Design a protein around this ligand. Structure first.
Ligand code: NA
Length: 247
């Protein structure tokens, strides 16, 4: 599962392009915008400016997932989903370039202001991802990631969605368990770390469209995602954004 130098170089490019989607879409996020409009802007950027491939061509009909509020993941862009101030929005994107892909998602607070709880949920979700990323280096264990995430999130009185906290990435599902469990990590491995944090119960449900996932209790959910490369001394965050403080 060790990526070659050529494979890693192509993943750096794709990861940077994916990061660029999440940064460039920011000024378009305001009250009154539909999530379909965001999808079209991202599709045009990926295909026609980056000259890359959005996920709807690789292995449905949209270039991004737009998950609002109680939607946990896989929200479908829609002309009828109109953002309003105080909404929390996750945009999830995969960019494919030259056979390799970069995967990342982040939260946006529509209008810059939201409730005490929604702000805290987003910040805890981002810090949870970072805590999981902080365990990773050559010789660490896959289980260290989920353990760090779950311990932190529950200490903050939120719930972790139990389906997964990450996946192998290339072209393996990361679960919550005990530290020291799972595969020992080696420099050159790549995967995503993407914990989903619910304000209420950890249970989710799939909507009638067999695609959109929502919290079981209709409370808020937040997620962040990075694609990471394992190194001898730590990680390289392939989807890091330039103004993103990784300390
Ligand atoms: Na959500």
């Amino acid at each position: 599962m060790i990526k070659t130098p050529d494979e890693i170089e192509k993943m750096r490019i794709a990861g940077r392009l994916a990061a660029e989607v999440l940064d460039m879409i920011k000024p378009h996020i305001k009250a009154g915008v539909s999530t379909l409009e965001l999808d079209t802007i991202c599709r045009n950027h990926i295909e026609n400016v980056q000259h890359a491939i959005p996920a709807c061509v690789g292995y449905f009909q949209h270039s991004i997932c737009t998950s609002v509020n109680h939607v946990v993941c896989h929200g479908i862009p829609s002309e009828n989903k109109i953002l309003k101030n105080g909404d929390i929005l996750n945009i999830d994107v995969t960019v494919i370039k030259d056979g390799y892909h970069g995967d990342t998602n982040m939260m946006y607070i529509v209008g810059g202001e939201t409730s005490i709880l929604a702000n805290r949920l987003c910040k805890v979700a981002q810090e949870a991802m970072y805590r999981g990323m902080a365990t990773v280096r050559d010789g660490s264990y896959l289980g260290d990631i989920g353990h760090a995430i779950q311990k932190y999130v529950e200490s903050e009185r939120f719930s972790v969605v139990r389906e997964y906290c990450g996946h192998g990435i290339g072209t393996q599902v990361l679960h919550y368990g005990q530290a020291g469990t799972g595969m020992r990590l080696e420099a050159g491995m790549t995967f995503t770390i993407e914990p989903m944090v619910n304000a209420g119960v950890w249970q989710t449900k799939l909507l009638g469209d067999k695609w959109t996932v929502v919290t079981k209790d209709h409370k808020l959910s937040a997620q962040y995602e990075h694609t990471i490369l394992v190194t001898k001394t730590g990680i390289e965050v392939l989807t890091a954004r330039p103004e993103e403080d990784l300390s």
